[PDB]
Amino acid sequence: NAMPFLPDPGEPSPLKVVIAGAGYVGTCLAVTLAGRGAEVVAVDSDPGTVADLRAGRCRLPEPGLAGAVRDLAATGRLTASTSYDPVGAADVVIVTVGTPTDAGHEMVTDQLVAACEQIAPRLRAGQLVILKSTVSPGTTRTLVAPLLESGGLVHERDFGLAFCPERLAEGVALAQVRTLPVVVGGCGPRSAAAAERFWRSALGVDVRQVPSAESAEVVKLATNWWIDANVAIANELARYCAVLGVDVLDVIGAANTLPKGSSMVNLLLPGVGVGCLTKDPWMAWRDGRDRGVSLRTVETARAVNDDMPRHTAAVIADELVKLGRDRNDTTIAVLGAAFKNDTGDVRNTPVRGVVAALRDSGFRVRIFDPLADPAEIVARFGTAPAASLDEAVSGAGCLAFLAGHRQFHELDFGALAERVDEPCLVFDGRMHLPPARIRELHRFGFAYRGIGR
Amino acid sequence: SNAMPFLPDPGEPSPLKVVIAGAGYVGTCLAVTLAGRGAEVVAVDSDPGTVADLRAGRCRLPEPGLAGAVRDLAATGRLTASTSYDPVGAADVVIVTVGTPTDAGHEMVTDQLVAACEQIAPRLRAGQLVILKSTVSPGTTRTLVAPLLESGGLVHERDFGLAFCPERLAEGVALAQVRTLPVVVGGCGPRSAAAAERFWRSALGVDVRQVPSAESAEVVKLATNWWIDANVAIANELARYCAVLGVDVLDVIGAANTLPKGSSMVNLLLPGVGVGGSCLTKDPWMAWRDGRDRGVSLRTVETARAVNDDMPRHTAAVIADELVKLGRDRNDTTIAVLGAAFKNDTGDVRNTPVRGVVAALRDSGFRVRIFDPLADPAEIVARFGTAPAASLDEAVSGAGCLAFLAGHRQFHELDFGALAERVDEPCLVFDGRMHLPPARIRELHRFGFAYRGIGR
Numbered sequence: 001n002a003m004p005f006l007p008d009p010g011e012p013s014p015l016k017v018v019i020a021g022a023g024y025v026g027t028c029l030a031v032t033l034a035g036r037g038a039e040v041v042a043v044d045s046d047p048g049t050v051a052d053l054r055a056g057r058c059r060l061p062e063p064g065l066a067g068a069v070r071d072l073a074a075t076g077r078l079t080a081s082t083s084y085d086p087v088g089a090a091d092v093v094i095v096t097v098g099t100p101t102d103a104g105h106e107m108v109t110d111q112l113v114a115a116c117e118q119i120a121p122r123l124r125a126g127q128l129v130i131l132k133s134t135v136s137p138g139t140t141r142t143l144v145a146p147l148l149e150s151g152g153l154v155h156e157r158d159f160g161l162a163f164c165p166e167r168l169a170e171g172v173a174l175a176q177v178r179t180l181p182v183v184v185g186g187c188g189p190r191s192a193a194a195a196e197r198f199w200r201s202a203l204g205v206d207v208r209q210v211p212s213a214e215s216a217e218v219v220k221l222a223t224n225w226w227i228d229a230n231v232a233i234a235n236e237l238a239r240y241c242a243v244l245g246v247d248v249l250d251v252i253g254a255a256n257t258l259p260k261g262s263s264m265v266n267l268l269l270p271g272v273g274v275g276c277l278t279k280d281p282w283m284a285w286r287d288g289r290d291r292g293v294s295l296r297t298v299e300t301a302r303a304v305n306d307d308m309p310r311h312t313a314a315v316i317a318d319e320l321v322k323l324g325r326d327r328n329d330t331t332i333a334v335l336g337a338a339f340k341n342d343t344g345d346v347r348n349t350p351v352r353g354v355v356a357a358l359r360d361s362g363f364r365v366r367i368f369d370p371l372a373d374p375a376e377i378v379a380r381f382g383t384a385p386a387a388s389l390d391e392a393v394s395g396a397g398c399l400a401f402l403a404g405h406r407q408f409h410e411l412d413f414g415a416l417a418e419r420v421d422e423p424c425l426v427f428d429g430r431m432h433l434p435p436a437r438i439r440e441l442h443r444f445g446f447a448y449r450g451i452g453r
Numbered sequence: 454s455n456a457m458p459f460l461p462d463p464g465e466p467s468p469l470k471v472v473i474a475g476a477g478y479v480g481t482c483l484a485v486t487l488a489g490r491g492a493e494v495v496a497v498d499s500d501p502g503t504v505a506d507l508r509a510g511r512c513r514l515p516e517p518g519l520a521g522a523v524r525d526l527a528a529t530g531r532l533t534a535s536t537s538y539d540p541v542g543a544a545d546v547v548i549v550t551v552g553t554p555t556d557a558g559h560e561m562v563t564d565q566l567v568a569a570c571e572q573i574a575p576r577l578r579a580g581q582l583v584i585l586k587s588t589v590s591p592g593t594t595r596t597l598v599a600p601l602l603e604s605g606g607l608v609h610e611r612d613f614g615l616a617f618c619p620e621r622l623a624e625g626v627a628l629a630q631v632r633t634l635p636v637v638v639g640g641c642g643p644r645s646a647a648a649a650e651r652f653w654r655s656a657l658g659v660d661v662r663q664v665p666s667a668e669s670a671e672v673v674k675l676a677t678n679w680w681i682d683a684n685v686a687i688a689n690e691l692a693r694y695c696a697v698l699g700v701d702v703l704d705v706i707g708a709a710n711t712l713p714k715g716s717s718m719v720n721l722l723l724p725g726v727g728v729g730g731s732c733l734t735k736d737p738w739m740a741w742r743d744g745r746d747r748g749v750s751l752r753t754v755e756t757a758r759a760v761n762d763d764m765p766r767h768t769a770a771v772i773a774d775e776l777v778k779l780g781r782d783r784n785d786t787t788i789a790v791l792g793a794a795f796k797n798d799t800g801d802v803r804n805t806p807v808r809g810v811v812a813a814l815r816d817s818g819f820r821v822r823i824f825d826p827l828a829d830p831a832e833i834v835a836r837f838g839t840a841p842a843a844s845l846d847e848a849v850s851g852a853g854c855l856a857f858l859a860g861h862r863q864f865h866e867l868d869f870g871a872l873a874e875r876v877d878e879p880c881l882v883f884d885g886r887m888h889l890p891p892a893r894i895r896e897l898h899r900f901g902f903a904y905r906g907i908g909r
């Protein structure tokens with residue numbers, strides 16, 4: 001009774017964890033928890049996803065993830081199911097299911113409601129439930145808690161309930177998840193103490209307590225709001241630097257040497273647009289609007305970042321005209337299609353906006369992303385990607401790096417110089433190449449341009 | 454003879470000779486720091502009162518430790534002053550820190566800068582180094598200052614060094630920051646950049662961050678104030694959003710800022726009662742106007758300025774609303790505004806957001822008493838149209854509200870148990886810029902106060 005909702009971490013028998021949702025977040029969580037000794041079962045409605053995990057397969061490009069899935073599924077500590085039945089035997093249940101938003105920027109509770117309606121009858125006294133899915137504030141306590149209580153139990157008294165925002169760093173997720181402190185917002189002191197004991201023992205990280213689940217839900221929304229609004233500042237700064245003939249990355253690097261606030265001045269890097277950062281700031285805006293608060297910094301940031309794909313296409317076409325090129329003699333090789341660097345997800349990518357604007361004007365575009373699924377590129381771009389990097393760049397008049405994947409940095413530009421059509425423009429969207437690499441491109445005959453570079 | 458370096462070898466026995474044009478806040482902080490490390494400095498200013506003060510070892514600038522440093526160095530003879538620009542000829546380095554105010558259209562008023570350059574230009578000799586530190590619109594150093602300095606026959610970069618090095622001092626801790634902050638150097642060429650870097654490293658003992666041009670360094674200064682002002686806007690809107698959920702914005706900011714991001718961490722700034730001073734209310738508009746002239750729209754600046762300009766009025770509306778919810782009216786409540794300065798731990802009220810809060814409260818029918826022991830009483834009369842209270846007891850005795858609109862360290866050290874016996878019960882404690890932790894809020898309630906803040 002003194003230590004509710006979690007066994008002593010020193011117990012010989014392993015901790016039993018059920019993770020609802022076997023997406024990017026769920027898989028990273030499952031692998032890192034199983035790796036530290038817990039017995040984990042990932043629950044997902046997709047039979048294909050469950051079949052892959054059970055056979056130690058993972059198609060996610062996240063570094064070290066496919067290897068860890070294959071190793072842990074073989075040790076038996078990582079398993080998967082389409083059924084929510086393993087919830088009954090679990091000590092901890094983590095909910096990472098999808099929470100999208102409609103055109104009005106209001107939560108689509110469907111997936112979360114369905115997951116909660118499956119967990120509720122299987123929920124047992126003494127269990128700990130943690131919500132990781134990004135949600136509108138008040139959701140854990142006013143929507144999720146009554147759904148979980150439909151099975152007769154009471155949150156905080158019979159089972160622990162806490163909101164812990166997901167803050168995974170793509171491309172380095174497995175490394176960051178083992179060091180990054182977890183924010184815990186308990187639905188009461190018992191739920192707060194148990195959620196903190198769980199992350200410290202099962203994950204081995206520090207914990208940052210906030211006084212309610214609503215406070216922790218706002219931490220997630222405030223983080224995405226801060227990131228989106230700071231990317232908007234950086235994007236506008238890059239367009240200002242471009243008209244002055246100054247390099248935005250030197251400006252940002254020098255500006256960020258000033259201590260300020262809780263750490264340093266932190267101008268974020270500009271890009272080709274934003275693709276968490278397009279829904280969560282609007283989610284806070286709609287919540288604010290319904291409560292009589294206008295979030296003007298969110299409205300402006302979204303308008304600024306939504307204009308960047310069209311501006312990127314305009315800059316590419318303008319630079320090609322300056323090189324004496326046109327839509328009749330140039331094929332553009334778009335290298336990298338994913339919304340974020342070192343990911344393969346193209347579901348909500350600003351690259352779609354760049355390609356559409358380049359095609360809408362009349363340019364021939366080839367797409368290549370070594371991390372993305374070719375069927376997903378067909379679905380989102382409407383065309384099959386190039387068979388390989390060599391096929392994409394051969395005879396291309398422009399190499400537009402619109403996602404800065406690590407394998408693009410390891411490319412031999414001397415070898416690329418022999419495949420492309422001279423004069424070739426290297427447009428740097430998300431590579432953010434250092435001056436030493438830009439000199440190498442010029443040496444091989446490439447023209448180089450970035451927004452504000 | 455060989456092409457010349459634009460700075461003498463710091464191995465020479467004679468002290469470095471520096472001339473600082475513009476002995477205001479930035480100029481005086483530089484002068485005492487350079488002279489304190491051994492350089493011989495002459496402060497050149499158009500105000501005869503400032504020149505007379507520096508000569509006598511006096512300084513009217515309230516900046517902590519500044520008057521003391523001036524007194525010590527005037528006695529050594531290393532720091533002197535002049536209304537005349539005749540010391541320029543003998544100097545190794547000329548630093549320009551004159552005022553660059555903007556007009557109603559946010560265009561820079563070049564009057565002081567042109568007058569300074571015109572006096573410097575014919576006294577310049579080959580091999581000298583000229584550093585511009587005043588905040589300017591990009592391209593000012595190369596297209597305005599350089600041709601004015603060349604009127605004597607010298608050619609910038611070939612005959613003398615010209616660099617832009619922005620000042621990044623924060624008011625109240627300027628003397629501590631001038632000796633620690635890395636200096637950004639934007640030379641008009643490689644020789645100017647090398648000399649300016651060697652100058653800051655050897656004469657100030659600080660690190661240097663080179664940027665490729667004077668224009669790049671001019672943008673660094675404007676991008677910094679743009680970033681700060683826009684991030685205060687995010688924080689103020691976040692506090693207003695937290696207020697409707699009843700969540701504490703300081704818990705949210707603290708937890709959010711534990712995430713590594715960019716080149717450091719997520720850095721949500723602290724909310725307040727608005728934004729004052731020249732830096733954050735003028736510099737982002739200067740960038741906006743320069744961008745507009747060149748066909749670039751800075752929408753984040755427009756929104757940040759609108760958001761922060763609305764904060765004083767919103768703060769007064771919150772105080773008035775919380776007083777009504779407490780059962781207090783305009784008839785039985787005198788509000789004591791504690792802290793008038795634009796910033797915590799300074800006395801500067803020249804452009805303070807507290808002015809807007811006080812004016813909006815009075816326009817709601819409330820009597821307001823002002824108390825700020827760090828501020829000049831005459832400065833409060835000129836900005837607020839009323840004399841501040843003689844003492845803390847006069848301000849708080851019988852007050853129905855204690856509105857902490859500047860969070861000076863002095864206010865954190867008050868005896869709230871004693872205050873509780875002087876105020877009119879029930880007394881509202883409004884936290885504008887104290888940012889009290891939950892333990893301190895609990896203590897106020899135990900003493901009988903009603904604590905409120907935006908998003909607290």
Ligand SMILES: NC(=O)c1ccc[n+]([C@@H]2O[C@H](COP(=O)([O-])OP(=O)(O)OC[C@H]3O[C@@H](n4cnc5c(N)ncnc54)[C@H](O)[C@@H]3O)[C@@H](O)[C@H]2O)c1
Nearest residue numbers: 475477478479498499500551552553565568569587588620
């Ligand atoms: N105030 C700050 O904290 C701060 C911080 C960073 C940057 N800056 C920039 O530094 C510059 C100076 O700021 P400040 O607050 O010290 O200014 P200030 O207006 O208070 O002082 C300027 C001084 O220059 C003198 N002066 C004017 N024209 C002159 C001339 N032709 N010859 C000689 N002296 C002349 C004036 O008499 C005055 O004493 C501004 O461009 C400002 O943007 C200020």
Ligand SMILES: Cc1cn([C@H]2C[C@H](O)[C@@H](COP(=O)(O)O)O2)c(=O)[nH]c1=O
Nearest residue numbers: 623685722723724725727728729795796
């Ligand atoms: C840094 C900072 C400044 N401000 C406001 C107070 C001052 O009026 C103005 C300038 O502050 P600064 O000189 O400390 O940057 O901006 C905030 O409200 N929150 C903050 O976090």
Ligand code: NA
Nearest residue numbers: 699700701909
């Ligand atoms: Na609260």
